[PDB]
Amino acid sequence: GLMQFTLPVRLCKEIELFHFDIGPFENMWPGIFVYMVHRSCGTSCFELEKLCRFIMSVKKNYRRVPYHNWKHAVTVAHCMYAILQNNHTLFTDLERKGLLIACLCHDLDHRGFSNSYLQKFDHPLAALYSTSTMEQHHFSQTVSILQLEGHNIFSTLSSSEYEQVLEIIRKAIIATDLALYFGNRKQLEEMYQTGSLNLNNQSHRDRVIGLMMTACDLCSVTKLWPVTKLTANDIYAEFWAEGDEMKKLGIQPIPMMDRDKKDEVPQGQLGFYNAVAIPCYTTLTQILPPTEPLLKACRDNLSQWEKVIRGEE
Ligand SMILES: COc1c(C)cnc(CSc2nc3ccc4ncccc4c3[nH]2)c1C
Numbered sequence: 001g002l003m004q005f006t007l008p009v010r011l012c013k014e015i016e017l018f019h020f021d022i023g024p025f026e027n028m029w030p031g032i033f034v035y036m037v038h039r040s041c042g043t044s045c046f047e048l049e050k051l052c053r054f055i056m057s058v059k060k061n062y063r064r065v066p067y068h069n070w071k072h073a074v075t076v077a078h079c080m081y082a083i084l085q086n087n088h089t090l091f092t093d094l095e096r097k098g099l100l101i102a103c104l105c106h107d108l109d110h111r112g113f114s115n116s117y118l119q120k121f122d123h124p125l126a127a128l129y130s131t132s133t134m135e136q137h138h139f140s141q142t143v144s145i146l147q148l149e150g151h152n153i154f155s156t157l158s159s160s161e162y163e164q165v166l167e168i169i170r171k172a173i174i175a176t177d178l179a180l181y182f183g184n185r186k187q188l189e190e191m192y193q194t195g196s197l198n199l200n201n202q203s204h205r206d207r208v209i210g211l212m213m214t215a216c217d218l219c220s221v222t223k224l225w226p227v228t229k230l231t232a233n234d235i236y237a238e239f240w241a242e243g244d245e246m247k248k249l250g251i252q253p254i255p256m257m258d259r260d261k262k263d264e265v266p267q268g269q270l271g272f273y274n275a276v277a278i279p280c281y282t283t284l285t286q287i288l289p290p291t292e293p294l295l296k297a298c299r300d301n302l303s304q305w306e307k308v309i310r311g312e313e
């Protein structure tokens with residue numbers, strides 16, 4: 001009960017900032033997550049014995065893929081922590097409990113392949129879940145881990161609070177399907193501009209939570225330039241392995257996944273920042289003004305990718 005996690009001074013300070021990198025020491029990541037839960041939620045939100053056993057089971061069910069790994073889970077959870085901390089009063093006790101857990105779990109048992117590759121391969125998951133294939137799997141795996149003996153971190157919630165939190169996590173994880181982001185943001189953009197956006201409207205909260213999940217999932221583009229650049233190597237390492245597997249099925253991959261078209265990475269990063277990243281953090285900043293540092297970091301990284309093209313790096 002009286003057992004806090006404490007971090008070294010530099011981590012204690014930097015963890016509060018949006019651009020924090022969780023570092024290369026894997027054994028510290030569980031403590032960093034527990035720390036974020038305690039400060040975001042309370043030392044009482046979860047039984048520490050059960051949380052610690054949940055965290056270690058979730059870690060075990062992430063695979064050794066270049067990008068969609070345990071480090072990504074904790075990175076995405078930290079970005080959600082930074083959003084929740086800078087927006088204290090806008091979120092309920094259940095939402096703060098649910099969203100950190102959702103982020104940690106959002107990519108459980110990822111194999112390093114897109115929903116498209118699963119469909120073209122005719123993977124069994126593509127028969128079980130026709131849309132948002134991996135995201136439905138990620139939620140399935142989250143529920144399975146919650147049902148292991150001694151892993152139910154939500155046991156002290158009423159039957160209805162339990163159903164509400166599982167429904168927050170499910171929508172949260174489905175929302176990380178980027179195919180769903182474009183529509184969700186257009187709708188949020190229209191509602192904000194015509195003044196109809198209402199945070200007591202549950203269907204509106206869902207949309208806002210969806211956008212927070214996309215913002216946290218993409219937070220690679222909001223770090224300091226060297227973190228951003230080095231994470232892009234991991235992202236492409238997965239994409240180019242998928243492109244290799246497309247070629248093996250006799251299908252030309254899209255250029256993003258073709259290692260033969262490495263040279264076009266800088267131009268492709270420009271399209272992505274302009275088409276996805278900047279619009280994402282712009283709509284989020286309009287809805288939650290204290291998330292502006294993410295939009296500012298994202299614009300800085302757009303400018304760095306423009307310098308790569310112009311041969312200055
Ligand atoms: C996970 O989301 C991302 C993040 C965070 C960062 N960077 C990316 C990659 S964006 C991207 N879009 C394109 C389009 C064409 C390309 N042609 C050749 C080489 C790279 C390309 C590319 N990269 C994603 C998808």
Ligand SMILES: [Mg+2]
Pocket residue numbers: 106107134176
């Ligand atoms: Mg995912």
Ligand SMILES: [Zn+2]
Pocket residue numbers: 072076106107176217
């Ligand atoms: Zn993710």
